C-alpha cells in the first residue's frame with residue numbers, strides 16, 4: 358500500500374508518475390496576432406487534463422479512494438496543478454512563462470486577455486521564489502502531490518463513515534509526503550532547523566498557488582464555456598475507466 | 604529586534620498582542636428578521652479592523668516594515684485574519700459560527716444572503732478540523748501571524764533594493780515563527796516526526812483559509828461598497844499614526 362512506502366520509494370513513484378511536456382498546437386508559419394491567446398491556453402489545458410488524470414492515478418494512495426472523491430480532488434485542484442507545473446517549467450526562464458516549449462510568454466504578451474497580466478505577474482513571482490529557493494525536482498513532485506490531496510480535502514460533503522475513512526487515508530498519505538520532504542532535506546545536509554524552515558516555506562507557497570488558481574477561476578467562470586458537460590462529469594469518464602485494454 | 608527573540612519571547616509577545624472579543628451591535632429586544640445579516644457582519648468587520656491594526660503593530664517585526672508594505676500585508680490578509688479568529692472562536696461550538704458572543708449562527712441562518720451558506724460550510728469544516736487537531740491557543744497565534752506576514756509577501760510591486768530587504772526581513776520573521784511552532788510541539792512531547800507532520804497539517808489549513816477569503820472577497824466585490832475611500836487609504840490612516848498621544 359501507499360502507507361507502507363519508504364521515502365525513497367515515494368520519491369521514485371512520484372518521479373515515475375510525471376506527465377509529458379506537451380506542445381501548444383498552432384501553425385508556426387502564421388502571424389502571432391492571428392492566434393487567440395485564450396484559445397491557445399484553453400486547448401493546452403484540455404490536453405494536459407487527460408495526462409493529469411493518468412498522473413493522479415499513479416500518485417500513491419489516490420486510486421484507493423472512491424471515484425467520487427477522486428473527482429472531487431481533481432475538480433478542486435486541476436488549476437493549481439497546472440500552475441505549479443508551469444511555475445516549475447519556468448524557473449530557468451526569468452521574466453517568462455514556459456507554457457509549452459513553443460509558447461514562452463513574457464508579461465507584455467500577458468496583456469492580450471483582460472485580467473491576465475495580473476495572473477501572469479503572480480506566476481512569474483512564484484517562479485522567481487522557487488528559483489531563489491533552489492527548488493529541487495524531488496521536492497517539486499512532493500508539492501504537486503500535496504496539492505492534489507489537500508486542495509479539496511476540507512470540502513467533502515459528508516461525515517458518513519466512508520467519508521471519514523477517506524479523509525483519514527488522505528491525511529495519512531499527506532503525512533507520508535511530509536516525511537519524504539523532510540527526508541530529502543535531511544539527505545541534502547540541511548540542519549533540522551533548516552529542514553522545518555524550508556518545509557514551511559514550501560508549504561506557504563502553496564497558499565499563493567491557491568490564490569492564483571482562485572483568481573484564474575474567477576476569470577474562467579466569468580464568460581461561459583462551450584455549454585460544457587460539467588467538469589465533474591468529464592472527470593468521472595476519464596477516471597471511471599474500464600479494464601478492457603489490460 | 605524581532606530577529607533576536609527566543610521562542611518563549613515570541614509566544615509571549617503574540618499572546619499579549621491578541622485583540623479583544625467584540626460584540627455585534629443590535630437591539631436584542633428586536634425581531635431577528637428585522638436585522639440585515641450582511642449589515643451585522645459588515646459592521647462587526649469594520650470594528651474589528653481597527654483592533655486588527657493594533658494587533659498587527661504588536662506582531663514582532665511588522666512595524667520594522669514600511670507603511671506602504673504594512674498596508675499591502677493587511678490589505679491582502681484582513682479577511683483571512685478575520686476568518687481564522689472566527690474559526691478559533693467557534694471550535695467549541697459544533698455546527699455553529701461564533702461571530703461574536705451574541706451572534707452565534709448555524710448553517711441555516713447562513714441561507715439569508717445568497718452565496719454565503721457555502722462559505723459558512725467551509726468555515727464550520729475548518730473549525731471542526733481544528734477541533735480534531737486539538738489546536739492550542741499558542742499555535743493559533745503563530746498561525747494568525749503567519750497569515751499576516753505571508754499572505755501578501757509574493758505580490759509586492761518591486762525588486763528595488765528596499766523591497767528586497769523588506770521581503771528578506773518578512774521571511775526571516777516567518778522562519779522565527781516556524782521555529783516557535785516547532786518549539787511548542789517539542790515542548791508538548793511530540794516526536795520529531797509528529798512535529799513536522801503537525802507543522803505541515805497546520806500550514807496546509809492556511810491554504811483553505813486563503814480559499815475561503817477569496818470566495819468571500821468574490822461576493823464583496825460583486826455588489827458595490829459605500830462609495831468608499833479605498834481600503835488601502837483607510838489602512839494608511841489607521842497605520843500612519845502620529846506620536847502626539849504618547
Ligand SMILES: *[C@H](CNCCOc1ccc(/C(=C(/CC)c2ccccc2)c2ccc3[nH]ncc3c2)cc1)CC(=O)N(C)C
Pocket residue numbers: 395398399401402405439440442443456473476572573574576577578579580581582583
Ligand atoms: C470556459 C472553459 N475553460 C476551460 C479551461 O480553460 C483554461 C484553463 C487554463 C488556462 C490557463 C491560464 C493561464 C494561467 C489561465 C488564464 C486566464 C484565466 C485562467 C487561467 C492555463 C492553460 C494551460 C496551462 N498549462 N500550465 C498552466 C496552464 C494554465 C486557460 C484557460 C471558461 C471561460 O468562460 N473563459 C472565458 C476562458
Ligand SMILES: *[C@H](CNCCOc1ccc(/C(=C(/CC)c2ccccc2)c2ccc3[nH]ncc3c2)cc1)CC(=O)N(C)C
Pocket residue numbers: 641644645647648651685686688689702719722818819820822823824825826827828829
Ligand atoms: C462592500 C464593503 N464590504 C466591507 C467589508 O464587509 C464585510 C467584511 C467581512 C464579512 C464577514 C463575512 C462572514 C464570513 C462575509 C460574508 C459574506 C461575504 C464575505 C464575507 C465577516 C465579518 C466579521 C467577521 N468576524 N470574524 C469573521 C468575520 C467575517 C462581511 C462583510 C462589499 C459589498 O459590496 N457587499 C455586497 C457586502
